[PDB]
Amino acid sequence: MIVSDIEANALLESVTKFHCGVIYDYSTAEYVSYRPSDFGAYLDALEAEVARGGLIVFHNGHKYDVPALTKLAKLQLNREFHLPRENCIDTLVLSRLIHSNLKDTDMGLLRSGKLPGALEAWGYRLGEMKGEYKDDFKRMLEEQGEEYVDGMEWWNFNEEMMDYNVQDVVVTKALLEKLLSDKHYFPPEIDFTDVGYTTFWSESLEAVDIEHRAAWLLAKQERNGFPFDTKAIEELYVELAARRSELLRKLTETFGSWYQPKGGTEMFCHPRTGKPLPKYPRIKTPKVGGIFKKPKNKAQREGREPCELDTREYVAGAPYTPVEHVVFNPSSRDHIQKKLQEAGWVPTKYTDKGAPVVDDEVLEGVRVDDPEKQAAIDLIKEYLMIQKRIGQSAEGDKAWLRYVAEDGKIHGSVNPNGAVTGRATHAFPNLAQIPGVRSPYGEQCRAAFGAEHHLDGITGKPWVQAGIDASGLELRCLAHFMARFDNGEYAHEILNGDIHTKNQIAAELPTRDNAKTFIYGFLYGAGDEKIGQIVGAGKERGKELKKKFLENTPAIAALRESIQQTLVESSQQVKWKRRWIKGLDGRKVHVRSPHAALNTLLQSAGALICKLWIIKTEEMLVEKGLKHGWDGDFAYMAWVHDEIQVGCRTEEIAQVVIETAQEAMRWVGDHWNFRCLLDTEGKMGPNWAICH
Amino acid sequence: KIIHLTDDSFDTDVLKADGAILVDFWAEWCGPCKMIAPILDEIADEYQGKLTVAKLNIDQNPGTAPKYGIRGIPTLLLFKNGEVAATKVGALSKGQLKEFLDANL
DNA sequence: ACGACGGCCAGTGCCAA
DNA sequence: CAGTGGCACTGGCCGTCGTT
Ligand SMILES: Cc1cn([C@H]2CC[C@@H](COP(=O)(O)OP(=O)(O)OP(=O)(O)O)O2)c(=O)[nH]c1=O
Ligand SMILES: [Mg+2]
Ligand SMILES: [Mg+2]
Ligand SMILES: [Mg+2]
Ligand SMILES: [Mg+2]
């Protein structure tokens, strides 16, 4: 086993030069440094470890180092280099599995201070090395007079870079040994730093293997990227900007501008009493200035000739209130609240901070006498929505248009195990929150992401898309877990026609989607009123649906109680018996709250099932001769919880991807002895609007 | 004796007054504005004949002030033949207003 | 001497699963 | 007591840097 890390000139997207690398070999207990001209030797050493059936440990090597080395070896040495997946270990992947309850800076992409809770020390260190090295580099330049530029610290190799490269390795080594010391994931009877790769995967908890395979597969999906229709989105941006401007014009005509105090420093005091009046706007008492200018002549200084007028504008001692002119901003909840109350509106609900709530619910219910302002409320709702779309598609910091790469794809980032439950998190941009087709502008947004937007490298023909989503996943998970209470009764009922449509009708709800947000909000602990809001009714209607569904399957109560009995010994300050659930693959799953336990249990089950699912799906495809890549037959474009969108070179392949995903899901179900049959629904089409 | 302006009457009451008009831009929530108010009442009298005192509440009438780049209140704009002859910002005292007026009139 | 502006940071809300 | 996430906007606050 060896521990390594490299330093190169840029992020994977445009890296073109290997600067250095360090290797720590457990068999020798020594560190070896490779400088820019030792690149060939560095790669030879990694391959030697592979040839010995050994292991290579990186920190974020799955997403960076490994692919980087493959790319740099090709560019710099014209060498083919491909470390096999089974020989690689990633301490970041391990760290995210074992410390799933914690957050991390995602290797410096996120600000430490903005994250909640604590951060693991070693990993925190590794994530700060880049910014830390940059500070030392800058400090040294300003020490020698030289100026600093953009990011010149990475243009050339230097010994300071080399030293950091060495530190990463000693720190990665320490992190590794810390993770290996966790008895829950690694049996104590085995020295995992002294075994071949097969032993490492077979002797460690199943979760260790799953996490590394998921990260490797997902690293690849990131590189693939999601084919994006830039043109279509820029045209949508124009249309949305026009609508925004029009709404702003109408809203500003209706709600005029006004003045507010701003820039006041001193306290206003009663001229007579002299007592401070903190509630009065802050003021400013000029120090210089009068009606006339100070006398400049002798006689003028005696009252011979009138003094020059002081064009100034202020008079010493004469206080005034500094103000600013403010124009109505439909995006300002504060502005909206101000104008509506000035129109007669009397707020009913306020925030825990005192501000009146101004969301779509209240706006919908606001009633003011003036008919023009009453109508303006709709323009405001539309406006807030238009902004939501513009921000996500064009103007936000993570706007799609700011992320399209040269290859015409958006390479969304994914933290395979970012959520406590074992689900992944998506960001930069978040491809897991694209507006749905049935929401305003949804079809246009959704259609911009699609295989059709990718033209085959050889034939120039657009690729096809295969979208597969697991059927009623978390409800089937529920059936599985309560089977010990109802003997698979629910597990059988659930597959008698669509479960959500069956509930939709029974609950008398408008859409199938509404039935979904209802059942899950209900299943996971929503209160009577929350259930009302979801179904567009009151707390009264909430209690009904609650007792109706809870009465229909009393196993829900039994499952909830058993979970409590297992986690809580006493209880909001809680006394825990155990604070974690045992996931399907053996991992510990932190429970934040007794009340949320059921959600932890089911979301986790669904997450691990889906994770093993996408892994098994790709493997089955590869064993069928299909190659993963734009230069092949298929390409993973996105994984949104229990759904995958795959680009395929041909319809035939798309048909096979859909059927293979179904075989894989059933394999996963059999693999973990699930008490409910698992299924998937697939669709073939040009983009995401049609494939989901 | 003070003229209470509105956005719609500001043009003919001030910009076409053909005489000296002292306009006061104020707001009910300003400390200095409440101070100078009493002073403007007295001034209105004493200067009746050679000066007209007018007040414009920037809250009730938000369209006028912006055109004059109001950045502080109370703002005292002395108009003569449709144009600003002199401007002074602040709760001047009785005497200071007098010096100012007598000097610009 | 003063004020525009870019990070930081809570508040608030809504997008998706 | 829906849970699990990401992220856009406003507005308060402050140290940097160009303007008066
Ligand atoms: C929408 C939504 C979903 N969830 C969880 C629990 C389910 C999974 C997957 O969602 P999906 O819409 O596929 O649901 P699924 O049951 O798979 O329905 P399909 O058969 O995919 O339509 O996400 C939730 O907790 N709250 C929600 O509001
Ligand atoms: Mg590294
Ligand atoms: Mg589903
Ligand atoms: Mg889904
Ligand atoms: Mg959140």
- d(Cα A664, Cα A351) in Å, to the nearest integer? 47
Looking at A211, A226, A241, the residue that finishes a domain is A226
Between CA A454 and CA A90, with CA A607 as vertex, the angle to 5 degrees is 75
Measure Cα distances from A227 to A214, A454, A465, A520, A529 in Å: 22, 6, 10, 32, 42
Are A594 and A692 part of one and the same domain? Answer: yes
- d(Cα A180, Cα A543) in Å, to the nearest integer? 49
Residue by residue, what is the 3-state secondary structure of A450-493? CHHHCECCCCCCECEEEEEEECCHHHHHHHHHHHHHHCCHHHHH
The token pair that represents A597 in the structure block: 């336990």
Are A166 and A300 part of one and the same domain? Answer: no
| Among the listed residues A615, A594, A591, the one whose alpha carbon sits nearest the alpha carbon of residue A603 | A591
Q: Are A310 and A293 in contact (CB under 8 A)?
A: yes
**Exp. method:** X-ray
DSSP state of A281: P
| Catalytic pick among B20, B22, B23, B33 | B33
The token pair that represents A178 in the structure block: 């810390």
- d(Cα B15, Cα B7) in Å, to the nearest integer? 12
In this structure, the number of other CB atoms found within 10 A of the CB of residue A149 comes to: 10
The domain of A127 spans 1-226
CA of A524 to C1' of C13 (A): 21
Q: Is A647 exposed, middle or buried (0-12, 13-18, 19+ CB in 10 A)?
A: buried
Q: Whose CA is nearest to atom 11 of ligand 1?
A: A472
- d(Cα A524, Cα A606) in Å, to the nearest integer? 14
Asked if A319 lies within 8 A of B91 by C-beta distance, the reply is yes
SS3 content of chain B, % helix, strand, coil (to 5): 35, 30, 35
Are A312 and A219 part of one and the same domain? Answer: no
Longest dimension (CA), chain A: 112
Question: How far does chain B reach from its first CA to its final CA, in angstroms?
Answer: 19
Question: After which residues do gaps appear in chain A, with C to N over 2.5 Å?
Answer: 571
- d(Cα A359, Cα A657) in Å, to the nearest integer? 42
Are A401 and A415 part of one and the same domain? Answer: no
Contacts of B70 in chain A (CB under 8 A): 259, 323, 325
| Among the listed residues B67, B54, B96, B33, the one whose alpha carbon sits nearest the alpha carbon of residue A292 | B96
Residue A87 is part of a domain; what is its CATH number?
3.30.420.10
Q: Which domains does chain B have, with CATH numbers?
A: 1-105 (3.40.30.10)
Question: How far does chain A reach from its first CA to its final CA, in angstroms?
Answer: 44
Are A486 and A465 part of one and the same domain? Answer: no
A260 Cβ contacts chain C strand, under 7 Å: no
Contact partners, residue A284, CB within 8 Å, separation at least 6: A263, A264, A265, A266, A319, A320, A321, A322, B72
Residue A415 is part of a domain; what is its CATH number?
3.30.70.370
- d(Cα A359, Cα A640) in Å, to the nearest integer? 27
DSSP three-state, residue A414: strand
Residue by residue, what is the 3-state secondary structure of A337-371? HHHHHCCCCCCCCECCCCCECCCHHHHHHCCCCCH
Residue A520 marked in a binding site:
yes
| A562-601 residues labelled b (16+ CB within 10 A) or e (exposed) | ebbeebbeeeeeeeeeeebbebbbebbbbbeebeebbbbb
Q: Measured from the CB, is residue A469 less than 6 Å from ligand 1?
A: yes
What residues does A469 pair with on adjacent strands? A643, A681
Are A203 and A296 part of one and the same domain? Answer: no
Ligand 5 centroid to Cα of residue A362, in Å, is: 22
Looking at A198, A226, A254, the residue that finishes a domain is A226
* Shortest CA to C1' contact from A114: nucleotide: C9
Q: Are A108 and A77 in contact (CB under 8 A)?
A: no
Q: Are A669 and A677 in contact (CB under 8 A)?
A: yes
Q: Is A374 exposed, middle or buried (0-12, 13-18, 19+ CB in 10 A)?
A: middle
Residue by residue, what is the 3-state secondary structure of A608-646? HHHHHHHHHHHHHHHHCCCCECCCCCEEEEEECCCEEEE
Cis peptide before A36 (omega within 30 of 0): no
The token pair that represents A431 in the structure block: 């491809």
- d(Cα A250, Cα A330) in Å, to the nearest integer? 11
Q: Considering every ligand atom shown, identify the ligand nearest to the alpha carbon of residue A7 and give its number.
A: 2
* Shortest CA to C1' contact from A334: nucleotide: D10
Are A379 and A507 part of one and the same domain? Answer: no
Q: Are A221 and A65 in contact (CB under 8 A)?
A: no
**A643-648 vs A464-470, strand pairing mode:** antiparallel
Resolution (A): 2.5
Q: Which amino acid does the sequence have at B28? A: E
Residue A294 marked in a binding site:
no
Asked if B90 lies within 8 A of A271 by C-beta distance, the reply is no
Q: Which amino acid does the sequence have at A441? A: Y
- d(Cα A563, Cα A524) in Å, to the nearest integer? 13
- d(Cα A654, Cα A660) in Å, to the nearest integer? 10
Main-chain phi, psi angles of A255, to 5 degrees: -110, 105
Looking at A194, A226, A258, the residue that finishes a domain is A226
B33 is catalytic: yes
| Catalytic pick among B17, B27, B30, B89 | B30
Mutate to test the interface with A, among B36, B88, B102, B104 (most CBs of A within 10 A): B88
Q: Between A290, A309, A320, which is nearest B32 by CB? A: A320
- d(Cα A185, Cα A197) in Å, to the nearest integer? 16
- d(Cα A579, Cα B73) in Å, to the nearest integer? 61
Q: Are A57 and A176 in contact (CB under 8 A)?
A: yes
- Nearest-CA residue to the C1' of D3? A599
Are A215 and A271 part of one and the same domain? Answer: no
- Our CA dihedral for A609, A614, A618, A623, rounded to 10 degrees, sits at 10
Are A393 and A356 part of one and the same domain? Answer: yes
Are A339 and A419 part of one and the same domain? Answer: no
Of A642, A645, A676, the one to substitute when testing ligand 1's pocket (max ligand atoms within 8 A of C-beta) is A642
Are A588 and A524 part of one and the same domain? Answer: no
DSSP state of A151: T
Residue A372 is part of a domain; what is its CATH number?
1.20.1060.10
Are A55 and A34 part of one and the same domain? Answer: yes
Q: Are A343 and A368 in contact (CB under 8 A)?
A: yes
| Among the listed residues A376, A148, A361, the one whose alpha carbon sits nearest the alpha carbon of residue A252 | A376
Domain count, chain A: 4
Between CA A41 and CA A46, with CA A43 as vertex, the angle to 5 degrees is 115
